[PDB]
């Protein structure tokens, strides 16, 4: 009855694609050979978020906690709130909701409450400026991540209002057979519960690395003053590179911690962004998952998107293996017919997806 | 079922606290709605 996976890798993508496809899965051996074996609290609260979003889906955790049974149900949405734990920020829970977000009965108006940022997760500016435009040109038109207040780790206390309100039928078929020309490069440097000079130090470091490329650099600056600052000191920086003729974007972020020089963090995020531009072609290394997920749940046509050589990795092909494991589809990597670079063009024939939850 | 009017409010510690700090704001700004002698 159940499609069986092993191990606690790609856990959110497995539960998300099972909710999209409507197929009952089992995930077996959730870190069974470990000292505290089983599911952790942040992924258990992600399961609670899935039960909040859907309706009629039965999730069945075992005694030992090392295997989970997800029999999915209808995405209904509604208005909710999610008090996610301190182990993961709000980006860890709003990232897998952007897949399920445009395919529900009622529009997503959720506000997550917890830590805003993390080193190894998505931020508010990451989710917004990077991951909303790829949905914005995959077919949705009204999506917004609002910050009402933001909380840096460890105490956090920041709330984030994810509101999507375009309930599309299916995402359109992508046709990106080009490398998009980067028109500008902008960003946002944020700081909470610290001095307002750290933001300008971060901005000056990032722009002194960026100054030798002949484009236009613009980094916006926000210090957070008052109750909107949260319960902990923190600061961070997120740059995007913006192709304006099509709308594409390539982002890179990080946050500082106890003992971190802001010019160091600014130049680090600037060089990390330029390396993402190098290893990128029409997507980012982190915008690539939901890009090819929307290409695989588009119409029953061929949609083609250009990628480069260095975007192929163990993460990307374990994504492709999980996609084929759930709903039996392959990607076809055809190479381009010009040879100053190594770029494939991934053509995916999408499954015949519609959202059948939206009332007619 | 539908009901005719709202019930009489129960007076708890939260509503006495809110009412008292309202009174304190008025009484430290001298926002008094008294009669003024002609």
């Amino acid at each position: 009855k159940y499609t069986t996976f092993q191990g606690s890798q790609n856990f959110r993508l497995r539960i998300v694609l099972a909710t999209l496809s409507g197929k009952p899965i089992k995930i077996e051996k959730i870190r069974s050979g470990d000292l505290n074996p089983g599911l952790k609290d942040y992924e258990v609260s992600f399961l609670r978020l899935i039960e909040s979003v859907t309706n009629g889906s039965v999730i069945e955790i075992s005694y030992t906690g090392t295997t989970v049974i997800y029999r999915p149900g209808i995405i209904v949405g509604g208005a909710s709130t999610h008090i996610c734990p301190s182990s993961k920020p709000v980006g860890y829970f709003v990232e897998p909701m952007l897949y399920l977000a445009p395919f529900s009965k009622k529009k997503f108006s959720i506000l997550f409450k917890g830590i805003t940022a993390s080193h190894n997760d998505a931020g508010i500016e990451a989710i917004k400026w990077g991951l909303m435009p790829v949905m914005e040109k995959f077919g949705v038109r009204e999506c917004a991540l609002h910050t009402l207040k933001r909380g840096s780790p460890p105490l956090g206390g920041g709330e984030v209002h994810l509101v999507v309100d375009s309930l599309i039928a299916q995402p359109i078929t992508m046709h990106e057979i080009d490398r998009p020309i980067i028109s500008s490069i902008t960003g946002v440097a944020y700081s909470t519960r610290v001095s307002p000079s750290l933001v300008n130090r971060m901005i000056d470091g990032a722009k002194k690395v960026l100054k030798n490329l002949q484009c236009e650099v613009n980094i916006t600056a926000d210090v957070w003053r008052g109750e909107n600052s949260g319960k902990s000191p923190g600061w961070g920086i997120t740059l995007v590179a913006q192709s304006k003729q099509k709308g594409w974007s390539y982002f890179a972020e990080d946050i500082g911690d106890a003992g971190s020089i802001p010019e160091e963090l600014g130049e680090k995020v600037a060089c990390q962004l330029l390396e993402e531009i190098s290893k990128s072609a029409a997507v980012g290394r982190n915008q690539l998952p939901l890009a090819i997920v929307y290409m695989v749940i588009g119409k029953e046509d061929i949609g083609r998107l250009r990628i480069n050589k260095e975007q192929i990795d163990e993460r990307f092909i374990i994504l492709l293996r999980d996609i084929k494991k759930i709903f039996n589809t392959e990607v076809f990597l055809k190479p381009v017919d010009e040879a100053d670079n190594e770029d494939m063009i991934a053509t995916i024939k999408g499954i015949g997806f519609t959202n059948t939850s939206k009332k007619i | 079922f539908d009901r005719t009017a709202k019930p009489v409010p129960v007076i708890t510690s939260e509503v006495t606290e809110s009412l008292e700090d309202m009174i304190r704001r008025r009484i430290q700004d001298s926002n008094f709605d008294d009669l003024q002698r002609r």
């Binding site: 519960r193 610290v194 001095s195 000079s197 000191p233 106890a258 003992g259 020089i261 | -």
Partner: protein, 231 residues
């Protein structure tokens, strides 16, 4: 022990001891103008002198003589220095209402603590190297968390001027002696005033805490030097 470093009003530094006579050596032209504050490192081999010629300088002990090797010129008259008690930070108080925290190992300019609103006297770094104090002529001492440079309290003491402020050895309690003939004992957790000691008659210019145990001496303008112990 048995050895004293000292800096004078004019551009001179001096070294003395306990067993022998006065002068090991003096260094004429140790600074261009008035020296204001020096600090040893916790091992003692390397000391820092900040002076009103808008410079700080570093000195090493070569064998028992002083070796000037590096000098950091600022835009403004530095008037206090301190290092952390674990060789980690160099916090220097400028005349321009701010302090700067550097890394000793890089001259890295970690932090700039700002917002005191008059020129700023004595600093102190805590034993865990996490919490600093900042005294000034604004009649208040500010507590700063050194990890992100974030302020914690801005407690108003001492209605004339806090001349000096010093931690205890092992705790986050501290003392502050001021220009209005009073020393004051505080804690760094509730930020109460533990005690308000009232024995001097005039401006208390300095105080020094024991390295271990924690009895504190205070010395003032009425030519008095007095000891403070536990009950």
């Amino acid at each position: 022990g048995l050895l004293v470093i000292l800096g004078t009003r004019n551009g001179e530094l001096q070294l003395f001891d306990l067993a022998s006579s006065s002068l090991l050596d003096t260094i004429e032209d140790a600074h261009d103008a008035a020296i204001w504050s020096l600090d040893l490192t916790s091992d003692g081999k390397r000391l820092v002198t900040g002076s009103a010629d808008k410079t700080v300088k570093f000195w090493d002990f070569k064998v028992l003589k002083l070796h000037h090797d590096t000098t950091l010129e600022l835009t403004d008259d530095i008037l206090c220095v301190r290092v952390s008690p674990d060789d980690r930070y160099l916090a220097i108080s400028l005349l321009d209402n701010t302090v700067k925290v550097f890394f000793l190992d890089s001259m890295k300019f970690y932090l700039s603590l700002y917002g005191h609103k008059l020129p700023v006297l004595s600093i102190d770094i805590s034993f865990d190297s996490k919490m600093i104090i900042t005294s000034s002529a604004d009649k208040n001492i500010k507590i700063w968390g050194l990890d992100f440079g974030d302020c914690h309290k801005s407690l108003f003491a001492h209605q004339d001027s806090i001349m000096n402020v010093k931690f205890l050895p092992q705790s986050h309690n501290f003392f502050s002696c001021s220009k209005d003939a009073v020393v004051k004992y505080w804690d760094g957790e509730k930020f109460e005033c533990i005690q308000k000691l009232y024995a001097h008659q005039s401006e208390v210019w300095a105080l020094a805490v024991a390295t271990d145990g924690g009895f504190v001496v205070s010395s003032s303008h009425d030519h008095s030097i007095r000891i403070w112990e536990e009950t």
